[PDB]
Design an enzyme around this catalytic site. Structure first.
Site, PDB file in Angstrom:
ATOM      1  N   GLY A 181       1.192  -0.268   3.589  1.00  0.00           N
ATOM      2  CA  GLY A 181       1.679  -1.543   3.996  1.00  0.00           C
ATOM      3  C   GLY A 181       1.603  -2.572   2.926  1.00  0.00           C
ATOM      4  O   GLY A 181       1.417  -2.241   1.937  1.00  0.00           O
ATOM      5  N   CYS A 182       1.833  -3.806   3.260  1.00  0.00           N
ATOM      6  CA  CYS A 182       1.742  -4.807   2.348  1.00  0.00           C
ATOM      7  C   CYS A 182       0.287  -5.234   1.982  1.00  0.00           C
ATOM      8  O   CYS A 182      -0.193  -6.155   2.440  1.00  0.00           O
ATOM      9  CB  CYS A 182       2.750  -5.917   2.581  1.00  0.00           C
TER      10      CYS A 182
END
Ligand code: SRM
Ligand code: SRM
Ligand code: SF4
Ligand code: SF4
Ligand code: SF4
Ligand code: SF4
Ligand code: SF4
Ligand code: SF4
Ligand code: SF4
Ligand code: SF4
Ligand SMILES: O=S([O-])[O-]
Ligand SMILES: O=S([O-])[O-]
Lengths: 435, 104, 385, 435, 385, 104
Positions: free
Chosen positions: B102-103
């Protein structure tokens, strides 16, 4: 490496070319005028051009998925990245990005930036982003072993920390505010700075359901775009009257002062016409111009800034200042884009900012417990309801909270609000209403 | 690459995470210790590792930080005192779970 | 040699400093700014890229705004520093759109600085510090990583930005527009930056479902995260085979997939980038200021244009056309979104000559209905012929 | 007669009292002037007031849930209803409503209505609704055995059918159209009648996933509210120029002709200001008044009807007439209220209306097979998408189909539109992109 | 006692006529209308409730619009007929708002008709055929069955409507508003008719979850339909045990229930009506015409007022207050919605004195977000004090 | 009320639908026959009844008209020829399914 026909095309044209710049650094590192003992390959930037050129030919990125690197004590701050052609481009086998905390509104001294460049030239690629969209100084490209070395130098010799990344609070940024703008309703930089320092722990160690951002605008013009790019936007405003200097108004009408401070001088729009350019454009129609006098029915003014923006020498913001808090902004993923929704119409905005901080902490208390995994505040608001957000912040519902009341009749009520509650026996009802 | 340690072999990625959870073994933890700034493994360490392992087998994902703290009773501060790199890069790696995504 | 900073990998926690945050902005203020902060009277835009702020006490500070590529070298940074030390007592700043601003306290020094800046160009020709970006102009483009650093892009960032700013350069160095025109680019639908709230937004998009690496998916991915990552519920858990053996994996219903790539963000075993399939979607009409009209999202007007490195002509041309038509038809103070809300969408397409496709009609959940037309109000255009 | 304290209160006031009217009918049936042999209790109306009075007291309905009654050959037209206190009010134990097909725009002759009343007085309550909200003549209250009798009299004697009810096409309705209005762009009553006759099978027999309604408006002003209360709305308009009589315009400016035909007469609004009441109110600002000369940039006219509505004697509808088709309107349940969305901007509307019927049938063919159980057309549109609707009606997508284009990027493409299709080998991808 | 029609219940299908539909309108046309249909030149509103249409050839037709209770007896209908036979050659019609229009071809007959109509009243005193409903006035109220015939109402229809028309009577017989004000009522959220697109809408609502007759439910209900009938998925199938007996049933999560009553519509075993719980929600700002502004939905401004038979004073007073403030503050041609859009919601509330509650803030699915305020634009009002 | 026919007893409501589906039996159909305009039950009538019963037992609901026709092969017109009152008031009633609901 190394021949780059496609990228070379991007050296043409007037606008500063990133290719010409990257090539200058490649030449500088190859020459090594200062005799630096580069801690990563001197050819790092060279390989970056090369892999970029290949991406241009294939139309496909050449960076492997993700990457998890960092410094001890923090759960974020570095975005690791590995190229997907290690043998072809060894210079970017590792090409990590380090996000460095920047001063509010990005004011710098040459001595400071030069100090940063000295550390990065020695331990990095020599390439940067000034600045990343959230505000951080971006040191673009280094190897894993240099992360702790860079961090040690930044903290011990430059008194500078890393920025944020991950499911936490991100680096806060503000417009330049009172440093060089007469529209600023509060010290955006100061609030930004103090809060960044107050919440260091939330920024360096992921404790939230997802990412969270702060942005501070000095007025509705939104120069740091807090309303579109932060989960918690503080936008300054005033509560009293706009200040009007009739002598200045006449100077605009006479042509001495140019509308919008000369922002439309590159075209002949004709002589300034106060009725067509100001009074007639006010969204609420609360302005009046008669017998050469300009007046504003402040009670019906939404403080959109148009008249002030257009006649800044004649019309000033009020003196009873504060800010509005709007929350929930986010990019589309997953459930759709969102801009900040007005939560607190007017709140005090003076140091130590206890008022604003209380709203922040109340929202976190709720969201940290109720938000689902990877759910932005804006999406939690959609799922649980705006009313819940008002409760948890102790905010009374007001008309200002909606652009329009609901048009569906699916209204929830609290049991205690309904006489008799919800416990009913079907047998009793059925004595009134036979089956 | 394949880590060769204590007569055991562990396939890993560039960041040192196990490619297969099923390849986890007690020696893996003893291997990754220093790289994760841990000199001695305590019962509190194992308690976290054990929870991450059970949660992953049962739910198929790493637990939210909130859940990790609530169940083990360790606040985030304690978690970092135990794993300097954090629950992700540190505990999850040591527990054999897959690399976080993910980020960031 | 290994040149240590002092860090000890054997005792990492020794001597470790944490939670100090950034340096305070006040330490880097020009004296004129430090002294007059909060006491500004008014400002005036003297020319493209040049401003002046006047304090209540008469003090003045002149600002020269210079375009910049965002992605820059330490050498470039050092040159900006050389300039600041020469004319600004060592001070400078960067804007929220990544432009550089040099500040001086008098008009003589301002003239000298400006003359200096104009002489600085790269060997290959481009200006190093072009002056402009003030008033009703097109001031730089907020953008992302692209192929320079990210793993989920559908297009590049730096390349397209250079291409577009070259064609719109005359708009950066002048103030001839009806209002500011903000242009932003994002290399994928995560839309980092400002695309969703810009006058003109460029977003990289995919047109093909992701590939599924069954042999490694269960090992490398948190299945539930991949399932919950799909906005259209196109991912589900399934049993697959690897070497004739059963394994846990996922299945993608291509008819529910709109190629956003969020599942790949959460799972490295679901790559989807594709040279011919990837491209750019063009959006228009957004703004974040509250001036006159409320803020608004940009709307997709051209669903897809192909990636054409190194100068993306098809895309560049469309962006140029939109600005030209807007600048010619809009009224003073009208932002692109304001202009379109006045003339109507059918007129927007008629005037720009852009091809409208069914792809631009919203079909995402219940809010989509609101994007349709619930009124008999429409104008006859070539579309209907 | 029961005591009715609360209903008696509603005999007071100027507005025609339904209580006083119902009481008059009770008296009539009590005296029975005609000597009918009432097929249902003469005291039926007396009981409806009795039970209505009970409902006022208790604040709750006294009708049992549902009811399923009808006539052979049809699957609807009659709304069954049973009182839940049949011992207390024997006269409404059965209280069915019969829905009767009405003439377009409800034009009647005394002879016809009297004939209907003769049958009803005999076989029902004496109570009606004139008219149901869909349009039907509503015959309020009778008993099951009377149904077939009523139906037989209605068809053999009065050449009148039942209206519709249930999961089928309902009674269509139109505004008065060309019968009494100079704004009518097509013969709404004819289209309504023709389509009602054409589609009888679909109206009398449930074949659909849910209910479906037709409404026909002569122009945008919406006198039958088609865009709000029908799934398929046909609204008239023109495609040529608005007809302007300059001299009439002068008669307005002068005072001879009253604005909006006198609609605001009851109040002093000042004298007419063509600029303030017409040119300045035009939604598109396509009107101009210069030198006592009104003109209209028709290319930019959205035909909202305002100027025409305001100066009916000077501005007329065009001569090239037709209609717009808007679809999907429905009340909230389940998924939220909808108004009709523009599907066909302009279509012919001349007898026998084939173009319009083509659209209707294409929509039904699709919806009948794709619509889920009890899913309104509007909801099918939201679930499957507006683009599908376009495809099945052979309609090309145009800007007119949106109020705004999408702001999410979750765009679906057809495989065939994408070079290479969707079948890819990850093996080949890995050739370029190392894991 | 039985009197046959000729129908033979032993041979039900013999002699059955089907699919003949309605009688054709043209049958019913007064001569002047049949002759000039489609050839109208213009119209004029002569007084409140009286219109005249002039054909291009010169012919004229005068119309007199009268109020009606919608729910009427054959005796009343009869009376309308008698009037038509006396002044209109037996012709008459009904409007889309359930008013009765009478038409004549000359002014002398027009004056005689009007004088007569004015003398018709019930013994109790109410006018049988009040003239009006034209121009900028408050015409008849669009309404539903209520306690007179429906099993799912949360309030009555005929009663409230009377109570309100009495209070607004002066607005029906005069043309003194800025524009037409449509008032409509529905006795439950199914919203039959026009409440969702009216200037002022009144909707019956419940405040208590339904009671579940576990004992007979499976017997009486198709469980999957009740489950699917819930907009908030508050209904779930369960295996219940009642009096030691195992039976299929449903469970309702009162926490997800918003008392819409749709499950009851589908299942007779989930009754929810309640005397003190039920009441009326008040909505404003909707319209159906496309004049100037596009059509719009009415919005909930008062979440709950109680049912107070027989004259609903609380609700009636609010309606009158809204009409009063609007008529005074709105500009010519401004519908209630147009007016609110101009002054803003906080001002609407300030001016009407209405209490704003959190219940009016939308919380239903994704589209609710669009109803919140995404702008800094707001006015300070008593609310913020 | 309670219906007595062929030595059987069927509890019904005011519209003639069985209170309980399980009380259905063949005698019910012979009883309901005339009320619903059917002189003699045919193989086709039974094929409809059979379908309706199996569908209800399996799905808990009556089948949509499009499914009834598509499965039995009987168009709506034929279905009315078999059951003059229609699939709901006639077929479902005779099949023992509960009374249709909703708006109308
Ligand atoms: C570097 C930066 C872009 C730039 O070139 O300026 C960036 C880069 C990335 N962003 Fe961001 N985002 C950046 C500003 C933003 C912004 C704008 C802002 O903060 O002002 C947004 C919109 C506001 C918001 O929060 O929604 C933004 C919304 C996202 C999203 C969508 C989140 C959402 O809720 O919709 C993602 C995807 C996700 O989180 O799953 C994302 C994801 C990512 C990742 C971490 C992708 C990944 O999976 O690794 C990108 C890393 C690229 C790389 O290789 O370095 N990024 N991202 C910016 C941050 C740098 C900084 O330290 O100063
Ligand atoms: C009689 C009438 C009300 C009136 O007093 O005028 C009426 C009465 C009922 N309507 Fe309707 N509706 C009536 C016009 C409407 C309208 C307006 C229109 O057609 O112009 C609407 C809104 C438009 C639309 O179609 O949505 C309307 C939308 C509904 C709904 C909501 C449907 C939806 O999709 O949201 C329901 C509930 C349902 O279908 O589940 C419903 C349900 C009902 C039922 C059948 C309730 C029930 O479960 O049995 C009501 C029967 C009351 C009774 O005992 O007679 N009725 N209903 C009107 C029809 C009579 C006539 O044949 O001319
Ligand atoms: S947000 Fe307002 S205070 Fe801040 S720099 Fe922009 S115009 Fe000035
Ligand atoms: S700030 Fe905006 S709302 Fe207030 S007076 Fe000026 S233009 Fe009108
Ligand atoms: S926009 Fe998509 S691809 Fe571009 S930097 Fe942000 S996450 Fe990476
Ligand atoms: S690409 Fe987006 S739409 Fe296609 S399956 Fe992955 S997450 Fe769902
Ligand atoms: S909808 Fe248009 S044509 Fe029909 S009666 Fe109303 S004004 Fe006349
Ligand atoms: S109909 Fe409406 S859009 Fe056209 S001229 Fe007259 S006011 Fe303007
Ligand atoms: S609005 Fe609800 S309560 Fe009233 S008639 Fe229609 S269904 Fe029956
Ligand atoms: S009353 Fe409405 S919200 Fe409550 S359980 Fe029934 S269907 Fe669901
Ligand atoms: O780094 S992005 O997630 O803000
Ligand atoms: O009666 S309703 O279904 O229009």
């Amino acid at each position: 490496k190394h021949p780059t026909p496609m990228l070379d095309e991007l050296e043409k044209g007037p606008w500063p070319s990133f290719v010409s710049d990257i090539k200058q650094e490649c030449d500088n590192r190859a020459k090594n005028p200062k005799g630096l003992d580069y801690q990563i390959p001197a050819e790092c930037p060279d390989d970056l051009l090369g892999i970029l050129e290949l991406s241009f030919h294939e139309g496909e990125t050449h960076w492997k998925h993700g990457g998890i690197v960092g410094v001890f004590g923090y759960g974020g701050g570095v975005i690791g990245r590995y190229c997907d052609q290690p043998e072809m481009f060894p210079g970017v086998a590792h090409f990590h990005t380090v996000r460095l905390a920047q001063p509010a509104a990005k004011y710098y001294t040459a001595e400071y930036l030069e100090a940063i460049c000295d550390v990065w030239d020695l331990r990095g690629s020599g390439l940067t982003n000034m600045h990343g969209s959230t505000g951080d100084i971006v040191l673009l490209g280094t190897q894993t072993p240099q992360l702790e070395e860079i961090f040690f130098e930044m903290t011990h010799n430059l008194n500078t920390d890393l920025g944020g990344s991950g499911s936490n609070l991100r680096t806060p940024e503000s417009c330049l505010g009172i440093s060089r703008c007469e529209f600023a309703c509060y010290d955006t930089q100061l609030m930004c700075y103090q809060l960044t320092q107050d919440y260091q722990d939330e920024l360096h160690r992921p404790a939230f359901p997802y990412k969270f951002k702060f942005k501070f605008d000095g007025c509705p013009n939104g120069c740091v775009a807090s309303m579109a790019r932060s989960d918690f936007a503080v936008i300054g405003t005033w509560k009293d009257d706009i200040k009007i200097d009739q002598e200045a108004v006449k100077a605009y009408v006479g042509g001495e002062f140019k509308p919008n401070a000369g922002a439309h001088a590159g075209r002949d729009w004709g002589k300034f016409d106060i009725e067509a350019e100001v009074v007639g454009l006010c969204p609420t129609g609360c302005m009046t111009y008669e017998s050469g006098t300009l007046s504003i029915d402040n009670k019906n003014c939404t403080r959109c800034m148009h008249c002030i923006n257009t006649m800044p020498r004649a019309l000033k913001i009020g003196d009873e200042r504060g800010a509005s808090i709007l929350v929930g902004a986010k990019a589309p993923v997953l459930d759709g884009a969102q801009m900040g929704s007005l939560l607190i119409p007017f709140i005090a905005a003076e140091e130590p900012f206890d008022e604003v901080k209380e709203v922040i902490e109340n929202i976190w208390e709720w969201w940290m417990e109720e938000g689902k995994n990877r759910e932005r505040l804006g999406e939690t608001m959609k799922r649980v309801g705006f009313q819940k957000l008002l409760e948890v912040t102790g905010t009374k519902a007001v008309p200002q909270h909606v652009s329009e009341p609901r048009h569906n009749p699916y209204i929830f009520f609290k049991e205690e609000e309904v006489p008799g509650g919800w416990s009913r026996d079907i047998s009793d009802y059925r004595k009134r209403h036979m089956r | 690459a394949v880590v060769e340690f204590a007569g055991s072999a562990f396939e890993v990625d560039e960041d040192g995470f196990l490619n297969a959870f099923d390849d986890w073994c007690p020696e893996w933890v003893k291997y990754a210790k220093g790289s994760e700034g841990i000199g001695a493994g305590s019962a509190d360490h194992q308690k976290i590792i054990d929870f991450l392992q059970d949660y992953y087998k049962a739910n198929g994902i790493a637990p939210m930080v909130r859940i990790l703290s609530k169940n083990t009773g360790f606040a985030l501060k304690e978690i970092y005192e135990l794993f300097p790199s954090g629950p992700g890069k540190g505990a999850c790696k040591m527990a054999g779970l897959p690399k976080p995504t993910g980020c960031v | 040699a290994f040149i240590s900073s002092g860090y000890n990998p054997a005792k990492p926690m020794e001597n470790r400093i944490t939670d100090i945050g950034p340096r305070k902005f006040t330490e880097f203020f020009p004296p004129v700014i430090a002294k007059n902060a909060g006491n500004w009277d008014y400002h005036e835009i003297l020319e493209p890229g040049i401003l002046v702020h006047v304090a209540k006490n008469g003090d003045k500070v002149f600002t020269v705004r210079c375009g910049a590529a965002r992605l820059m070298s330490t050498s470039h940074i050092r040159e900006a520093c050389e300039i600041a030390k020469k004319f600004c007592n060592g001070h400078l700043r960067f804007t929220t759109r990544n432009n550089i601003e040099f500040m001086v306290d008098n008009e003589e020094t301002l003239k000298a600085l400006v003359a200096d800046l104009k002489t600085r160009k790269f060997a290959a020709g481009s200006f190093k510090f072009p002056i402009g970006g003030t008033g009703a102009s097109i001031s730089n483009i907020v953008h992302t990583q692209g192929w320079v650093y990210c793993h989920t892009p559908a297009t590049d960032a730096s390349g397209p930005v250079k291409a577009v700013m070259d064609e719109l350069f005359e708009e950066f160095t002048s103030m001839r527009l009806p209002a500011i025109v903000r242009v932003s680019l994002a290399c994928c639908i995560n839309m980092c930056g400002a695309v969703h709230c810009s006058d003109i937004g460029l977003v990289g998009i995919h047109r093909k479902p992701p590939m599924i690496d069954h042999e490694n998916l269960a090992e490398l991915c948190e299945i539930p995260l991949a399932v919950a990552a799909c906005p259209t519920a196109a991912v589900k858990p399934i049993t697959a085979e690897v070497n004739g053996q059963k394994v846990k994996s996922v299945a993608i219903n291509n008819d529910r997939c709109m190629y956003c790539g969020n599942c790949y963000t959460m799972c490295p075993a679901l790559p989807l980038s594709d040279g011919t399939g990837d491209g750019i979607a063009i959006m228009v009409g957004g703004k974040i200021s509250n001036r006159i009209k409320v803020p608004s999202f940009s709307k997709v007007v051209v669903a897809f244009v192909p990636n054409e490195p190194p100068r993306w002509p098809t895309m560049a041309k469309i962006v140029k056309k939109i600005v030209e038509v807007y600048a010619e038809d809009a009224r003073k103070y009208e932002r692109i979104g304001d202009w379109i809300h006045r003339i109507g969408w059918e007129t927007f397409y008629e005037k720009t000559g852009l091809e409208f496709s069914h792809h631009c009609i919203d079909d995402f959940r219940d809010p989509a209905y609101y994007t349709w037309r619930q009124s008999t109000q429409f104008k006859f255009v070539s579309f209907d012929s």
